[PDB]
């Protein structure tokens, strides 16, 4: 789990009337909770529960693409008759271990106050013991059979984990299976300075669909074609009055571009 949200609470340093543990304990148990996603790479799980008793993993609203590895894992304890919790749980697939601090990417993702960041610790393996032994080779001597025991979350599959690790090793080894003096730096690159956002349709500039059909009323999807189109073709563009024209003037000309700029290089290569 990576991001949780409980409707009643604001910050994980609070409590909730009815749950035996604090929100901090709930988050730690959640981190302890393991799950196996199959279809997608990130998913959202809703857990609703009411009534006295222990809330465990099985109680969450499971899906088909998602499977709880073990349901008996206790999440919290409701200790009142009319006490209830509903919580959304973001579960994303990743490699390794990322703390809650550095995972921030912008200055508005946390702005939803109910979004509690649980520092993700996703690694199915827990310990890997191994040892060599005398393999019962049909006719040879002192060949080695390697016995590897993995204590894991049960999430990953043992043979699958072995084969994945071996693939990783082979891929990393392919680096110097054919090593030679190689350098990615190729100084003095040569590329046309056409801006690639012009290749996209105009509607990709975060505005409504009526203005989209409006720029589809002049048959102008391209930004690389609208760039040769000043404001001399807007009130003449079908149904561009105040509101849709306000959208056109706001979301386009503010992103650093200009509504119609003369250029001689287009389109390479659309």
């Amino acid at each position: 789990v990576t991001e949780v949200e409980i409707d009643g609470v604001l910050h994980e340093y609070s409590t909730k009337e009815g749950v035996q543990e604090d929100i901090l304990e709930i988050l730690l148990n959640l981190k302890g909770l393991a799950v196996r996603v199959q279809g997608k790479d990130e998913v959202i799980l809703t857990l609703n529960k009411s009534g006295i008793g222990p809330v465990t993993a099985a109680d969450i609203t499971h899906d088909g693409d998602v499977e709880i590895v073990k349901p008996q894992h206790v999440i919290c304890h409701l200790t009142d008759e009319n006490a209830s919790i509903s919580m959304r749980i973001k579960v994303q697939r990743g490699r390794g271990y990322v703390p809650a601090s550095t995972r921030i990417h912008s200055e508005e993702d946390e702005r939803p106050i109910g979004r509690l960041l649980v520092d993700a610790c996703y690694s199915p393996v827990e310990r890997i013991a191994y040892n060599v032994e005398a393999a019962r080779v049909e006719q040879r001597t002192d060949l080695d059979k390697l016995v590897i025991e993995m204590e894991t979350n049960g999430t990953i599959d043992p043979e699958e984990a072995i084969r994945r690790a071996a693939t990783i090793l082979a891929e990393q080894l392919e680096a110097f299976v054919d090593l030679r003096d190689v350098r990615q730096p190729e100084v003095k690159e040569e590329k046309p300075e056409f801006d690639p956002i012009l290749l996209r349709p105009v509607d990709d500039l975060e505005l409504t669909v009526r203005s989209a059909n409006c720029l589809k009323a002049e048959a102008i999807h391209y930004i690389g074609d609208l760039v040769q189109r000043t404001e001399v073709e807007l009130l003449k563009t079908p149904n561009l009055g105040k509101k849709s024209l306000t959208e056109i003037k706001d979301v386009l000309a503010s992103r650093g571009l200009s509504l119609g700029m003369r250029l001689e290089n287009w389109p390479p290569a659309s």
Partner: protein, 50 residues
């Protein structure tokens, strides 16, 4: 001559990092030096690390 004292609180989940100061109960103090990856710490034959 004061009207409204507004006190605000701030909490930090202060994690551990190379540089803190930890000690046992016998004066064996020490600065933590490296968060070594789990696959590098010494480990017992039963696979458990230290």
């Amino acid at each position: 001559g004061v009207l409204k004292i507004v006190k605000v609180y701030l909490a930090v989940k202060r994690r551990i990092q190379p540089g803190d100061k930890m000690a046992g109960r016998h004066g064996n103090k020490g600065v933590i030096s490296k968060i070594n990856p789990i696959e590098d710490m010494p480990y017992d034959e039963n696979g458990t690390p230290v």
